[PDB]
Design a protein around this ligand. Structure first.
Ligand SMILES: *CCC1=C(C)C(=O)N/C1=C\c1[nH]c(/C=C2\N=C(C[C@H]3NC(=O)C([C@H](*)C)=C3C)C(C)=C2CCC(=O)O)c(CCC(=O)O)c1C
Ligand SMILES: *CCC1=C(C)C(=O)N/C1=C\c1[nH]c(/C=C2\N=C(C[C@H]3NC(=O)C([C@H](*)C)=C3C)C(C)=C2CCC(=O)O)c(CCC(=O)O)c1C
Ligand SMILES: *[C@@H](C)[C@H]1/C(=C/C2=NC(=C\c3[nH]c(C[C@H]4NC(=O)C(C=C)=C4C)c(C)c3CCC(=O)O)/C(CCC(=O)O)=C2C)NC(=O)[C@@H]1C
Ligand SMILES: *[C@@H](C)[C@H]1/C(=C/C2=NC(=C\c3[nH]c(C[C@H]4NC(=O)C(C=C)=C4C)c(C)c3CCC(=O)O)/C(CCC(=O)O)=C2C)NC(=O)[C@@H]1C
Ligand SMILES: *[C@@H](C)[C@H]1/C(=C/C2=NC(=C\c3[nH]c(C[C@H]4NC(=O)C(C=C)=C4C)c(C)c3CCC(=O)O)/C(CCC(=O)O)=C2C)NC(=O)[C@@H]1C
Ligand SMILES: *[C@@H](C)[C@H]1/C(=C/C2=NC(=C\c3[nH]c(C[C@H]4NC(=O)C(C=C)=C4C)c(C)c3CCC(=O)O)/C(CCC(=O)O)=C2C)NC(=O)[C@@H]1C
Ligand SMILES: *[C@H](C)[C@H]1/C(=C/C2=NC(=C\c3[nH]c(C[C@H]4NC(=O)C(C=C)=C4C)c(C)c3CCC(=O)O)/C(CCC(=O)O)=C2C)NC(=O)[C@@H]1C
Ligand SMILES: *[C@H](C)[C@H]1/C(=C/C2=NC(=C\c3[nH]c(C[C@H]4NC(=O)C(C=C)=C4C)c(C)c3CCC(=O)O)/C(CCC(=O)O)=C2C)NC(=O)[C@@H]1C
Lengths: 173, 64, 177, 64
């Protein structure tokens, strides 16, 4: 899928059939891996909104004047960024590596946030809730909704996706 | 480099082993029911959701 | 009644039409409680997915035979078709509330729908319960009786608009009974 | 008559009194922040949501 990342229109690429069978032989736990990716993207809205909501409820000064997500414009920008990050993490889990996340999402991002005054403590908490939420889904610890997968253990993939979130946290700290 | 264009990989996972097919959706070769699609899309601002989070952030949802 | 969007309903492609500014100010005079009415329509459409999914889920949890073999929403295809229909219906109700009448709902959504469902074996008891839950959910939003999400409106009374939208749901229920 | 084409009126309500404007989105006339948009679109099947309801219907949500 690398050409999707670098193409000018980002038009969709599709892999199925034998190409997808082959791809599932280069990464670990290919079927659980696709269920894990599916769990992230299928729930992207609620993951993002629960995570940004929690960063605010733990620090409501963030929606007061001078606050990081004061006004709808800034709240919407923050929700957008949380989704962007989440999606780069989903693509890292699909591909089994973080090179695109680091190159296209993280490189220069802390500098951008420092220039804008986007608060690092708030970003840290949004990322830690997104991580906890995704790991919760992948390990059957989500309480309202469960995944439609065969029952089993996905702890290795939870550790792997946790590491991708940790790369975000580390870069933005 | 982060390009400041809001574009992120949009991944979509398909499992159509139940045999339900939608017209015009075959986009790659394959007959076992599985497909992964990836596109690069600008992620949009959602004013309605921003309004809701501003109002409702202090409501615990989803048994958290 | 507000007729500005009539041409959207009848056009070949359904391309969007838009009204703002002084044109919209004048349009709102042709329906009661224009501002609260736009807020009510916004509450429906902004929450369309959760309204539909909570309503179909309740249908099923009260009558789980609906997802067993020979059931109305057995198989993902049937469940998806039912969630789609519930959204279609909710959207025609939202347009009824925007325009202050149910003529388009009756003509383009309900006229023929009972007979179609009879031909397909779509169970009336299940449709009745999805509709009554959607009605309760929408009324709950409009009357400050939603627990996980509150609206961002000025505080006040919207009981007349809740009664009006309840009537539009009742037309659906009556047509599909 | 119900035309069996899945097409339904999609109403969108805008309140941009906060002055936050997106490029390319002025489609009517006015500067007070308000707009109503209606289109007529085919409502699609959502396999992902159908899967979730089939799995999760027995869980009470939203304090219902
Ligand atoms: C995507 C929505 C969702 C469904 C559906 C589901 O079944 N679970 C879901 C989300 C989810 N959230 C968490 C964990 C946390 N959520 C929050 C924010 C809320 N807590 C607040 O105090 C607050 C303001 C009042 C909220 C809004 C937090 C803080 C967490 C914990 C994060 C942590 O560090 O552990 C999960 C993970 C499992 C769990 O229930 O804890 C999930 C799946
Ligand atoms: C859109 C989701 C939502 C948010 C967000 C919110 O704040 N309220 C929301 C939904 C909502 N639901 C209802 C009412 C009902 N929902 C159900 C379905 C669930 N009940 C079950 O037994 C079940 C299976 C286990 C469900 C799934 C039902 C039955 C109702 C009651 C319908 C009735 O006849 O009155 C409301 C209305 C307010 C309320 O709490 O009742 C709302 C706002
Ligand atoms: C943690 C992720 C989950 C968990 C996931 C499991 N999935 C298992 C088997 C499995 N999943 C799929 C579908 C998947 N593969 C694809 O190619 C695509 C679409 C591109 C998807 C959505 C398949 C085909 C399989 C193999 C079994 C089958 O044919 O259905 C699984 C069993 C162990 C294993 O096969 O590795 C598990 C445990 N299960 C959980 O309880 C957590 C929440
Ligand atoms: C600033 C970044 C805001 C934000 C604004 C957005 N509005 C979006 C779409 C949109 N807005 C209107 C109303 C506007 N157009 C008019 O003609 C009039 C009055 C005459 C007004 C008040 C319309 C009609 C539209 C749709 C345009 C169309 O149908 O082509 C929008 C795009 C969302 C998307 O692309 O998916 C944005 C980002 N959004 C935010 O979160 C901050 C608070
Ligand atoms: C039940 C529906 C709600 C409730 C709604 C109220 N809205 C009130 C006033 C109001 N709302 C708007 C925005 C609306 N008008 C438009 O044209 C559009 C977009 C096209 C929108 C989204 C305006 C401009 C106003 C009037 C200014 C004001 O009073 O703030 C309102 C006050 C009573 C009235 O004006 O008739 C209410 C009660 N309030 C509730 O508590 C439930 C949940
Ligand atoms: C039957 C009505 C089902 C239903 C199926 C749908 N699939 C939709 C989109 C879609 N499905 C695939 C996977 C398929 N195409 C392939 O090439 C391969 C393997 C080689 C398979 C397994 C793809 C790639 C797509 C997207 C096509 C595109 O990118 O243009 C779909 C449309 C969703 C929409 O219109 O928004 C449907 C309705 N959906 C259901 O709910 C029932 C159970
Ligand atoms: C949410 C958890 C945060 C929060 C986020 C904000 N980001 C704001 C502006 C902004 N964000 C980016 C990075 C974004 N663009 C990309 O292209 C990619 C990856 C490919 C990402 C992750 C940029 C470049 C910008 C400015 C330019 C733009 O929006 O196009 C923002 C507005 C800040 C301001 O204007 O002062 C916010 C509020 N803010 C918070 O407080 C929490 C911690
Ligand atoms: C959900 C609460 C129900 C349920 C709904 C089902 N409807 C099924 C097929 C279907 N629905 C319609 C009406 C729909 N199409 C429109 O154009 C309009 C309004 C403009 C509406 C409201 C049609 C025409 C059809 C058949 C053709 C099609 O889908 O394009 C359906 C599949 C039935 C089957 O194949 O056996 C279901 C499951 N089913 C339930 O059990 C609950 C009560």
């Amino acid at each position: 899928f690398s050409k999707v990342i670098t193409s000018a229109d980002g038009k969709a690429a599709y892999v199925g059939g034998a190409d997808l069978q082959a791809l599932k032989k280069f990464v670990s736990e290919g079927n659980k891996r696709m269920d894990s990716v599916n769990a992230i993207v299928s729930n992207a809205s609620c993951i993002v909104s629960d995570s940004v909501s929690g960063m605010v409820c733990e620090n409501p000064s963030l929606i007061a004047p001078n606050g990081g997500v004061y006004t709808n414009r800034k709240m919407a920008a923050c929700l957008r960024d949380a989704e962007i990050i989440l999606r780069y993490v989903s693509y890292s889990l699909l591909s089994g590596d973080s090179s695109v996340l680091e190159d296209r999402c993280l490189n220069g991002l802390k500098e951008t946030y420092a220039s804008l005054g986007v608060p690092a403590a708030g970003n840290a908490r949004t990322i830690s809730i997104m991580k906890a939420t995704v790991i919760g889904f992948i390990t059957n610890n989500s309480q309202q909704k469960k995944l439609s997968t065969p029952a089993g253990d996905c702890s290795a993939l939870a550790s792997e996706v946790g590491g991708y979130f940790d790369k975000v946290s580390s870069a933005l700290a | 480099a982060m390009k400041k264009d809001s574009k992120a990989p949009c991944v979509e996972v398909f499992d159509e082993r139940d045999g339900c097919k939608a017209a015009g959706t075959q986009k790659a070769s394959g007959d076992d029911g599985f497909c992964v699609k990836v596109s690069m899309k600008a992620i949009g601002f959602n004013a309605a959701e921003a309004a809701s989070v501003t109002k409702n952030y202090g409501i615990k949802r989803f048994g958290a």
